Write a protein that binds this ligand. Structure first.
Ligand SMILES: O=C1CC[C@@H](C(=O)O)N1
Ligand SMILES: [Mg+2]
Length: 379
């Protein structure tokens, strides 16, 4: 596994900036099928990262993809402008927001020191996997799409003399993410509901955050929390989930597999060693290829459904990731070792036949791990 050969691994440097901005960046990973047809089952999805430096503003624009924004660091204000409604939310770490495709948005990082980072999942509605940005704001740089219209049409549309309206669209030359003044920050944020306050909603609801809830799976060595479409209606159309997994330093998540959901995992903190069992790269008779590697901040690992996987935190940091789940509804985590695992639900005689060893002996071995989900890693 020279890593560029592991098709499920997408190193951080593979994310491509969509523009050159002074106060931040917006970078997107290539289509998942760029180097392998093994990922054709998730071809319509793209993941990206939005970074805003302190005291910055990202210009109004919309995308042709249905998105889910997850704040991984800092605080920022998102304002959404529809044809007949305005919504603004003050987002914080852990917030999850479903953004309808075609929503014109702008972002503001009002903090004086901390960067605002968002991990984004988008699903195409035009050609599979193609998601583009449409800058309504802008002029020469970023180019505003209004410049695609002839001057007589702009004049008639805006009821403004052509030279004046043309001029409006050529004043901006600073780029897509620029400096915001302290006043401007106060002004643009301020109608923004701060933990959320969706409205007593219909179309665009506010963010939700699960970081204060009890983990679905947890132990002294790690935690797993997930926003499922079963619980959050805003995620049903995309049939996506947003998972948060943290493995404490020196810990590991016990081998497990997802029953039907493919996960696009992005590292937000730390480092980890991963090992996955893949029958495709390996395998008439089936053979499981040992797909392994190391993950660093910003890297992405796609975990296909049904594939056994384990992550081992390395060095002196907890290892934290945000995972987007595709085909999420009805997905179940199946652990392969630990007190709570699938073998708890397999009878003794079946274990004996499974491993050609006395059933009580197989059970004795499977009961040695008294902990579940996350345990101390090798050392
Ligand atoms: O689909 C996407 C890509 C970028 C993000 C946005 O509109 O900022 N939505
Ligand atoms: Mg930049």
């Amino acid at each position: 596994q020279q890593e560029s050969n592991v098709p499920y691994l997408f190193k951080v440097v593979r994310f491509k900036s969509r523009f050159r901005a002074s106060h931040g960046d917006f970078r997107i990973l290539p289509k998942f099928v760029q180097r392998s047809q093994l990922l054709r089952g998730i071809e319509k999805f793209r993941v990206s990262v939005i970074e805003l430096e302190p005291q910055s503003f990202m210009l109004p624009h919309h995308c042709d993809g249905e998105a889910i924004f997850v704040v991984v660091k800092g605080q920022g204000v998102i304002v959404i402008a529809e044809q007949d409604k305005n919504n603004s939310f003050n987002l914080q770490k852990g917030d999850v927001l479903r953004l309808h495709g075609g929503s014109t948005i702008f972002l503001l990082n009002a903090d004086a020191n901390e960067k605002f980072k968002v991990y984004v999942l988008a699903k195409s509605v035009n050609a599979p996997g193609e998601v583009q940005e449409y800058f309504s704001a802008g002029g020469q740089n970023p180019e505003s799409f209004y410049r695609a219209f002839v001057v007589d049409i702009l004049e008639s549309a805006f009821n403004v003399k052509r030279d004046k309206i043309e001029r409006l669209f050529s004043q901006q030359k600073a780029g897509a993410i620029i400096s915001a003044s302290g006043a401007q920050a106060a002004a643009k944020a301020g109608h923004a509901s701060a933990a959320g306050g969706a409205a007593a909603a219909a179309r665009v609801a506010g963010p939700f955050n699960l970081m204060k809830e009890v983990p679905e799976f947890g132990s002294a060595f790690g935690q797993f929390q997930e926003a499922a479409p079963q619980r959050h209606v805003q995620l049903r159309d995309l049939d996506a989930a947003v998972a948060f997994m943290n493995i404490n330093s020196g810990g590991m998540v016990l081998p497990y597999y997802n029953s039907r959901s493919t996960r696009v995992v992005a590292v937000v903190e730390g480092n980890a060693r991963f090992e996955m069992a893949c029958p495709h790269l390996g395998a008439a008779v089936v053979h499981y290829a040992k797909v392994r590697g190391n993950l660093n901040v910003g890297d992405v690992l796609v975990i296909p459904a049904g594939h056994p996987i384990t992550f081992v935190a390395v060095a002196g940091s907890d290892f934290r990731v945000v995972g987007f789940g595709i085909d999420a509804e009805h997905n179940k985590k199946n652990f392969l070792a630990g007190k709570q695992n699938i073998w708890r639900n397999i009878d003794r005689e079946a274990k004996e036949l499974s491993f050609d060893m006395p059933g009580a002996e197989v059970e004795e071995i499977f009961a040695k791990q008294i902990l579940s989900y996350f345990v101390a890693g090798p050392a």
